Design a protein around this ligand. Structure first.
Ligand SMILES: O=C(C1CCS(=O)(=O)CC1)N1CC[C@](c2ccc(OCc3ccccc3)cc2)(S(=O)(=O)c2ccc(F)cc2)C1
Length: 253
């Protein structure tokens, strides 16, 4: 199954689907690198309440995940899977895709991330009270920045993060397996053609993405236990569904 001309076509459709749903253009994020938060603006974030910061971050994550849902819907073969499998793959992989996509918004020169219009370091998130999770995210982006990914590499690698046949809950495991194998062939074909197979050994282990997602869910249970009405009243419904039937509605459209 699948010849070279079908694998090359798969490369281009994955790359196109990603460009159409990448949220912020790479050029836009790069042209903003000199726009950094002043020490007074950083102090303003540190002085914000923990629940306000948690609500702003959960809001930004939700928006980014909505683009990931759109990337999945445009991905060859994903809409062909059953709804249960689509939801299982999105519930487990949407946050993982966002964690990879996030390296485009990270400047490794000053160790800053693009957040709410300007670049800021780890210290911008001190009010969250989850320094271990923040450092883990920042280190993860630092590690991905050393790979010097092209937009096409991120498109192909994020399609594979999402189409994972080993996710618990899958009803048509073989159909996801076949789709995964085709995307793996297309990612490796593209790396071989561009003389970039050296990155395979340097890609993060699968347990690193699982550890980041786990730390997120753990820090959320801590925050929710202290502010259950804040999560209930001010957190996005899609966020609560994923981490605490929006997905079904987003997939129907
Ligand atoms: O970077 C993006 C976007 C990706 C798509 S794009 O087009 O390149 C524009 C940028 N992000 C989308 C949202 C972001 C996000 C990342 C991780 C995350 O983890 C869960 C969490 C929740 C609450 C507290 C701590 C951690 C939540 C949101 S963010 O808010 O900017 C943020 C950033 C750093 C950080 F350390 C914490 C929050 C990253």
């Amino acid at each position: 199954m699948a010849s070279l001309t079908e694998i090359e076509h798969l490369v281009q459709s994955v790359c196109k689907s990603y460009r159409e749903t990448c949220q912020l253009r790479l050029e836009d994020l790069l042209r903003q690198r000199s726009n950094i938060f002043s020490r007074e603006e950083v102090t303003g974030y540190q002085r914000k309440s923990m629940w306000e910061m948690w609500e702003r971050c959960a809001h930004h994550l939700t928006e980014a995940i909505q683009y990931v849902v759109e990337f999945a819907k445009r991905l060859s073969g994903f809409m062909e899977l059953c709804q249960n499998d689509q939801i299982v793959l999105l519930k487990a992989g949407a946050m993982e895709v966002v964690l990879v996509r996030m390296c485009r918004a990270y400047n490794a020169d000053n160790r800053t991330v693009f957040f709410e219009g300007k670049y800021g370091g780890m210290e911008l998130f001190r009010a969250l009270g989850c320094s271990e999770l923040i450092s883990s995210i920042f280190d993860f982006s630092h590690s991905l920045s050393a790979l010097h990914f092209s937009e096409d590499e991120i498109a192909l690698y994020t399609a594979l993060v999402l189409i994972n046949a080993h996710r618990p809950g899958l009803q048509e495991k073989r159909k996801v397996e076949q789709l995964q194998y085709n995307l793996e062939l297309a990612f490796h074909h593209h790396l071989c053609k561009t003389h970039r197979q050296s990155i395979l050994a340097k890609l993060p282990p699968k347990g690193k993405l699982r550890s980041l997602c786990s730390q997120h869910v753990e820090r959320l249970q801590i925050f929710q236990h202290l502010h259950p009405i804040v999560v209930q009243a001010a957190f996005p419904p899609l966020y609560k569904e994923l981490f605490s039937k929006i997905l079904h509605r987003l997939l129907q459209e």
